[PDB]
Design a binder for these strands. Structure first.
Length: 118
RNA sequence: CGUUACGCU
């Protein structure tokens, strides 16, 4: 089985619970080194119709899902709008994302969609 | 190992 990254964080690295308002940019000093090095299972929303898959985490995104952008079909979209327009409005759009991409290629995953296999 | 393409994001 598995535990939600949201809980998993709430428990070992943060002490507090995430709410629609928490800003991880502040808990960053220790959060990132805490996260770097672990494996997570990305479970795409049911509306993506895609099988879960695993990634090594490299850290936190520099910005939250709502600010952080990438290129999709030749357009800027934030992580938040991307998930929204794929029929899954994020619960925490203000949360920073898990960075699983490499130096040349960004891949940012909303923490609510990530879990750790135990 | 490299380059495209396509996903992912």
């Amino acid at each position: 089985s598995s535990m939600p990254m949201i809980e998993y964080l709430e428990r070992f690295s943060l002490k507090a619970k995430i709410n629609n308002t928490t800003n991880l940019d502040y808990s960053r000093r220790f959060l990132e080194p805490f996260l770097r090095g672990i494996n997570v299972v990305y479970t795409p929303p049911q509306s993506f119709q895609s099988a879960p898959r695993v990634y090594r985490v490299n850290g936190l995104s520099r910005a939250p899902a709502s600010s952080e952008t990438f290129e999709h079909d030749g357009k800027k979209v934030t992580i938040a709008s991307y998930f929204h327009s794929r029929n899954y409005p994020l619960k925490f759009p203000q949360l920073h994302c898990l960075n699983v991409g490499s130096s040349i290629k960004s891949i940012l995953l909303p923490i609510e969609l990530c879990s750790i296999e135990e």
